[PDB]
Amino acid sequence: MFLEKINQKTGEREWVVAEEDYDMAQELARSRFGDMILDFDRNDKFLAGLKTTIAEKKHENTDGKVHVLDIGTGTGLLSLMAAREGADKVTALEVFKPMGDCARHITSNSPWSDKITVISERSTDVSQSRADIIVAEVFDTELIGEGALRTFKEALERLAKPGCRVVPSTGNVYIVPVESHLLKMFNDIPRLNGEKDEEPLGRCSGTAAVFDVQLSEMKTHEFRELSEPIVAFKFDFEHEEKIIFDESFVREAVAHSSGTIDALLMWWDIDMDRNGTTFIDMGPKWKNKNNYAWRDHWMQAVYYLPEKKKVEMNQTFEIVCNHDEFSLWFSNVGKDKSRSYCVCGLHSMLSRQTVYHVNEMFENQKFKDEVDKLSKGLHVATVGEGSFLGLLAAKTAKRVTIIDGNERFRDIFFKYIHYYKLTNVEIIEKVTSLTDSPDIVLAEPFYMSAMNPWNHLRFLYDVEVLKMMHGDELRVEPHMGVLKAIPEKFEDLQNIASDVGTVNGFDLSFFDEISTKARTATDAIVDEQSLWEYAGIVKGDAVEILRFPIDGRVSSQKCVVNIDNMSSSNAIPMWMEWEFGGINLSTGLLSISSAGVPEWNKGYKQGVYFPITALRNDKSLCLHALFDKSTGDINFQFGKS
Ligand SMILES: Nc1ncnc2c1ncn2[C@@H]1O[C@H](CSCC[C@H](N)C(=O)O)[C@@H](O)[C@H]1O
């Protein structure tokens, strides 16, 4: 139940929900699954699969009728598709109630009301005619992480006729081994002196959770394939005995080039009807010639072998491909075939992008030059949470005090101190335990706790506590920070937030209604996204929003600004920059090309606002921004002029 109210700043109408309804709504706010419904290719492929199987079943079984089951019906799209194009009957399940009513609602007010009936159970909990066809879009980037195996497997035994047909009928998962400095950087334990054999934290597989990334937006020069795609797994969705939760396979292939396997890229394809003619194929842009379509709710993934594996031109090599019910992982021959978890400690604290970020800074000569310059022969103190900056300062500083409140990072930092035998660094927990006045404070700033990637402003409070102790003249860097936005025309990104409307000639606008109400109730106004992964063209200069000078005091800060060039843009990115001594660190936009293509930092996610629909066509948008001394939070509202 959505409670209407009026934004007192922008006049727009918004909703809210009562605490008991919050979780329900949040879920329902995620029920769009980004661009899922606007993935016209995925739709045209389910349809086509439905045409074939409905026809062939019509033909086969004697009473020329056909009963289709839709698991995870969502808005009902897939049932509407089944009914139209022939299903005498369509029963359609959905574990999530509010999405149950949505699908009954839209499915009632329809030409196919007669044929379609919505049940709000999980497939795996049910007992009833038997189904002649099962249709289910119940996949994620890993293919199996959303329960698809059990879902088809069990539906097949209990819910469907023998000789059932299923849409999709079949799939493969492919891995491609690549050498890539880039990809390594997302997983590599930071090596302080740069050499290959440094292992200050011992060895680790890194994080086991999926690394989904848009590999289409990766630059050709950033990686080098060593071989042709390898089939890891084949799934057969029509035969329960072929669906198996825990599996392992050694796979073989012939390398077409020598190189080290820094990563294995993966994606899947599905055969919509078992004919070998109509596929959804998640191969990226650079290796997907007949069924490429941008989308975001599905993507490709990167995986890392636990140990180094080298491969040689024209020589055969093997990779062990493993899955349990929900996850895929890969390993080397003669090595433990179990799913591994970070044991190093670092993997499990830092995101992939932050791990990249730390390897980037460790390798950055220009940034390392300013640290050296600023640190020389001095006592420096570092603030941050999980920020390795202190360990650079150490190259040149007389003495470094790293202040980090998180016990787990201190242990990590103590391991770096031990492994490289650093003789000039101590670590303390609390800002107030810095009792020897340092010559300078250095920060990035980075706090792993930041609620939002554009907001590491705890730095500003830590600075004040150090000024209270040691005088307003305390030298600190960075000396100034600024929040910045820029109007951008994204190629496709915006489909994750824009209205869904009429799809394959079906009116889903009811779902836009409840989805928008849910979203206004639960979402942040400014999304977060790894913008290096999304293509587009910038439509104006970056504009300044809030600025945070460092010579105190900390102060709430207000900004109301017009953002122009929106009539041809479709999003507004936001990020932070800092003057660290004599250089500029950007957590976002790094450069813009002659043709207007922006480049973004891979080591952070950035903010993006997508114009609400009442605002889709305005030429300028009013952006109210607000930093609050009391919470350290920043709040945004976006309105008309
Ligand atoms: N075994 C199961 N039984 C019922 N619903 C399921 C399920 N597994 C997943 N779901 C639901 O299935 C949906 C997957 S999203 C796909 C929705 C819609 N069919 C479409 O194609 O656009 C989610 O709404 C989720 O809650």
Q: What is the C-alpha to C-alpha distance for residues 333 and 318, in angstroms, rounded to an integer? A: 7
Q: Calculate how far, in angstroms, residue 267's C-alpha sits from the geometric centre of ligand 1.
A: 21
* Helix (H/G/I), strand (E/B), else coil: 100: helix
Q: Which domains does the chain have, with CATH numbers?
A: 1-39+480-641 (no CATH), 40-167 (3.40.50.150), 168-348 (2.70.160.11), 349-479 (3.40.50.150)
Q: Identify the CA nearest to 444 among candidates 574, 269, 578, 304.
A: 578
Choose which residue among 35, 73, 118 to substitute to test ligand 1 binding: the one with the highest number of ligand atoms within 8 A of its C-beta: 73
Q: What is the C-alpha to C-alpha distance for residues 50 and 160, in angstroms, rounded to an integer? A: 16
Q: What is the C-alpha to C-alpha distance for residues 641 and 639, in angstroms, rounded to an integer? A: 7
Resolution for this PDB entry, in angstroms: 2.4
CB contact at 8 A, 581 and 477: yes
CB contact at 8 A, 85 and 43: no
CB contact at 8 A, 609 and 427: no
Atom of ligand 1 nearest to the CA of 46: 21
CB contact at 8 A, 508 and 15: no
The verdict on the CB of residue 137 being under 6 Å from ligand 1 is yes
- Active-site hit among 94, 137, 154, 238: 137
Q: What is the C-alpha to C-alpha distance for residues 27 and 24, in angstroms, rounded to an integer? A: 5
627-634 long-range contacts, Cβ below 8 Å, gap at least 24? 627/457, 627/546, 627/548, 627/556, 627/557, 627/558, 628/556, 629/554, 629/555, 629/556, 630/556, 632/455, 632/457, 632/458, 632/460, 632/461, 633/451, 633/455, 634/452, 634/454, 634/455, 634/457, 634/483, 634/546
Centre a 10 Å sphere on the Cβ of residue 5 and count the other Cβ atoms it contains. Answer: 12
Atom of ligand 1 nearest to the CA of 138: 14
Spatial CB neighbours of 236, under 8 Å, sequence gap ≥ 6: 169, 170, 242, 243
Residues of 422-453 as b/e, b for ≥16 C-beta within 10 angstroms? Answer: beebebbeebeebeeebbbbbbbbbbbebeeb
Q: Identify the CA nearest to 601 among candidates 532, 533, 537.
A: 532
Q: Identify the CA nearest to 104 among candidates 348, 317, 390, 93.
A: 93
The verdict on the CB of residue 124 being under 6 Å from ligand 1 is yes
Query: Which residue's CA is the closest to the ligand 1 atom numbered 18?
Result: 74
Neighbouring-strand partners of residue 489:
537
Neighbouring-strand partners of residue 224:
179
Name the percent of the chain in helix, strand, coil, to the closest 5. Answer: 25, 30, 45
CB contact at 8 A, 29 and 515: yes
The DSSP annotation for 41-60 comes to HHHHHHHHHHHHHHHHHHHH
Q: Calculate how far, in angstroms, residue 92's C-alpha sits from the geometric centre of ligand 1.
A: 10
Q: What is the CA radius of gyration of the chain?
A: 27
For the chain, the residue count is 641
The verdict on the CB of residue 73 being under 6 Å from ligand 1 is yes
146 is catalytic: yes
Q: Which whole-number Å values give the CA distances from 84 to 40, 55, 81, 506, in the listed order?
A: 17, 12, 5, 10
The verdict on the CB of residue 158 being under 6 Å from ligand 1 is no
Burial class of residue 288, CB neighbours in 10 A (0-12, 13-18, 19+): middle
Q: What is the C-alpha to C-alpha distance for residues 314 and 317, in angstroms, rounded to an integer? A: 10
Q: Identify the CA nearest to 138 among candidates 153, 127, 125.
A: 153
Query: Which residue's CA is the closest to the ligand 1 atom numbered 17?
Result: 74
312 is catalytic: no
The DSSP annotation for 252-303 comes to EEE-SS-EE--EEEEEEEEESSSSSS-EEE---GGG-SSS----SSS-EEEE
The verdict on the CB of residue 171 being under 6 Å from ligand 1 is no
Sign of CA dihedral 184, 189, 195, 198: negative
The verdict on the CB of residue 25 being under 6 Å from ligand 1 is no
Q: Where do we find the tokens 């003249």? A: 473
Q: What is the C-alpha to C-alpha distance for residues 269 and 300, in angstroms, rounded to an integer? A: 11
Angle 509-522/22-29 helices, nearest 10 degrees?
Answer: 120
Q: Identify the CA nearest to 521 among candidates 18, 96, 17, 1.
A: 17
DSSP class of residue 348 equals T
The verdict on the CB of residue 120 being under 6 Å from ligand 1 is no
Q: Calculate how far, in angstroms, residue 285's C-alpha sits from the geometric centre of ligand 1.
A: 27
* Pairing status of strand 89-93 against strand 67-71: parallel
Residues of 326-350 as b/e, b for ≥16 C-beta within 10 angstroms? Answer: bebbbbbeeeebeebebebbbbebb
Spatial CB neighbours of 492, under 8 Å, sequence gap ≥ 6: 35, 294, 295, 296, 534, 535
Q: What is the C-alpha to C-alpha distance for residues 127 and 124, in angstroms, rounded to an integer? A: 9
Residues of 245-256 as b/e, b for ≥16 C-beta within 10 angstroms? Answer: eeeeeeeebebe
104-112 long-range contacts, Cβ below 8 Å, gap at least 24? 104/76, 105/510, 106/75, 106/76, 106/80, 106/506, 106/507, 106/508, 106/510, 106/511, 107/76, 107/79, 107/80, 109/510, 110/80, 110/506, 111/84, 112/79, 112/80, 112/83, 112/84
SS3 string of 465-481? HHHHHHCCCCCEECCEE
The verdict on the CB of residue 147 being under 6 Å from ligand 1 is yes
Sheet strands (E) in 88-237:
89-93, 116-119, 131-135, 160-167, 170-179, 212-213, 224-225, 230-236
* Pairing status of strand 89-93 against strand 598-600: unpaired
Query: Which residue's CA is the closest to the ligand 1 atom numbered 20?
Result: 74
* Pairing status of strand 606-609 against strand 527-529: antiparallel
What single-letter amino acid sits at 242?
Answer: K
Q: Calculate how far, in angstroms, residue 497's C-alpha sits from the geometric centre of ligand 1.
A: 19
Q: Which whole-number Å values give the CA distances from 602 to 158, 183, 186, 192, 574, in the listed order?
A: 47, 11, 9, 20, 14
CB contact at 8 A, 453 and 475: no
Q: Calculate how far, in angstroms, residue 43's C-alpha sits from the geometric centre of ligand 1.
A: 15
The verdict on the CB of residue 33 being under 6 Å from ligand 1 is yes
Query: Which residue's CA is the closest to the ligand 1 atom numbered 12?
Result: 72
CB contact at 8 A, 381 and 408: no
CB contact at 8 A, 245 and 199: no
Choose which residue among 36, 39, 71, 154 to substitute to test ligand 1 binding: the one with the highest number of ligand atoms within 8 A of its C-beta: 71
* Pairing status of strand 170-179 against strand 263-271: antiparallel
Q: Where do we find the tokens 């086969």? A: 60
Q: Which whole-number Å values give the CA distances from 161 to 198, 273, 315, 366, in the listed order?
A: 59, 17, 48, 67
The verdict on the CB of residue 37 being under 6 Å from ligand 1 is yes
- Active-site hit among 14, 85, 146, 247: 146
Dihedrals φ, ψ of 185, to 5°?
-65, -25
* Helix (H/G/I), strand (E/B), else coil: 547: strand
